Amino acid sequence: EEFVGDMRIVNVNLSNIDILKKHETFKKYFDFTLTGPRYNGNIAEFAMIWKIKNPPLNLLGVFFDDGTRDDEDDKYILEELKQIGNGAKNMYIFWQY
Amino acid sequence: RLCQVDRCTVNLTEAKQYYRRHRVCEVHAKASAATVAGVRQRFCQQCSRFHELPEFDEAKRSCRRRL
Ligand SMILES: [Zn+2]
Ligand SMILES: [Zn+2]
Ligand SMILES: [Zn+2]
């Protein structure tokens, strides 16, 4: 398993983003109306809004399951997001195919 | 009158669902202070709610509670 401090990096593969609409855990945090992969600055409904910078082809989103962090569009590429967990126990990275 | 900040006339209808749900616009969610119901408050990042400034240490984005 991949770790940054007490935070586990968890890669999740999905056949499409629509699968997360029925995921008991993730469904409240995604904004399914948004174009391009987002990360969350906090834990609240629809919180995954911050545009990940220069995302790879298949990145669908990032969810930090705890903590708060800097919340800005087109600032952090995926590799940098791994460094701003700030108390998240898991960083879920959602991929297609 | 959807953003909780007194006199904020931002149309939250067209904002992301997060802002519509928490009755705060993007700028007011990030302001170090704003007048909410006549009181200097800050939008707590960790709580997604306005608190009075005494509930924060200095310029911290989240209140003193360690969640
Ligand atoms: Zn909420
Ligand atoms: Zn406002
Ligand atoms: Zn708070």
Numbering used by the authors:
A (entry chain A): 36 to 132
B (entry chain B): 61 to 127
Report text from the authors:
SAP05 binds both the von Willibrand factor type A (vWA) domain of Rpn10 and the zinc-finger (ZnF) domain of multiple members of two distinct plant transcription factor families, known as SQUAMOSA-PROMOTER BINDING PROTEIN-LIKE (SPL) and GATA BINDING FACTORS (GATAs). The SAP05 protein comprises a globular compact structure with five β-strands that form an internal triangular mixed β-sheet core. β-strand 1 (β1) locates on the long end of this triangular core and connects via a loop–helix–loop–helix–loop structure to β2 at the opposite surface near the tip of this core. The SAP05 residues binding ZnF and vWA are located at opposing surfaces of the effector with the ZnF binding surface comprising the loop-dominated surface (loop surface) and the vWA-binding surface the β-sheet-dominated long end of the triangular β-sheet core (sheet surface). Our data show how the bacterial SAP05 effector has evolved as a functional adapter of the 26S proteasome to bypass the canonical UPS cellular proteolysis pathway and enable ubiquitin-independent degradation of structured eukaryotic proteins.
The crystal structure contains eight copies of the 1:1 complex in the asymmetric unit (ASU), which are closely similar. In addition to the two structural Zn2+ ions within each SPL5ZnF domain, a further four Zn2+ ions are found in the ASU forming crystal contacts. These involve E80 from four of the eight SAP05 molecules and H82 and E118 from separate neighbouring copies of SPL5ZnF. The SAP05 loop surface that interacts with ZnF comprises three distinct protruding loops that are separated by β-strands and involves six amino acids of which D66 locates in loop 4, G76, N77, and E80 in loop 5, and R104 and D106 in loop 7 of the SAP05 structure. SAP05 binds the two SPL5 ZnF sites, which are held together by Zn2+ ions and the complex involve nine connections, with SAP05 amino acids N77 interacting with three amino acids, D106 with two and SAP05 D66, G76, E80, and R104 each with one amino acid of SPL5ZnF, and SAP05 E80 and D106 each forming two interactions with R81 and R121, respectively, of SPL5ZnF. The majority of the interactions are mediated by hydrogen bonds with some salt bridges and are reinforced by nonbonded contacts. The SAP05–ZnF interaction is dominated by electrostatic interactions of charged and polar residues at the SAP05 loop surface and oppositely charged or polar residues located within α-helices of SPL5ZnF. Titration of SAP05 into a solution of SPL5ZnF showed an exothermic binding isotherm with a fitted dissociation equilibrium constant (Kd) of 0.45 ± 0.06 µM and stoichiometry of 1:1, and titrating SPL5ZnF into a solution of SAP05 showed a Kd of 0.52 ± 0.05 µM. Therefore, D66, N77, and D106 are required for the SAP05 interactions with the ZnF domain of SPLs. Taken together, these results indicate that the electronegative surface potential contributed by D66 is an important factor for binding SPL and GATA TFs.
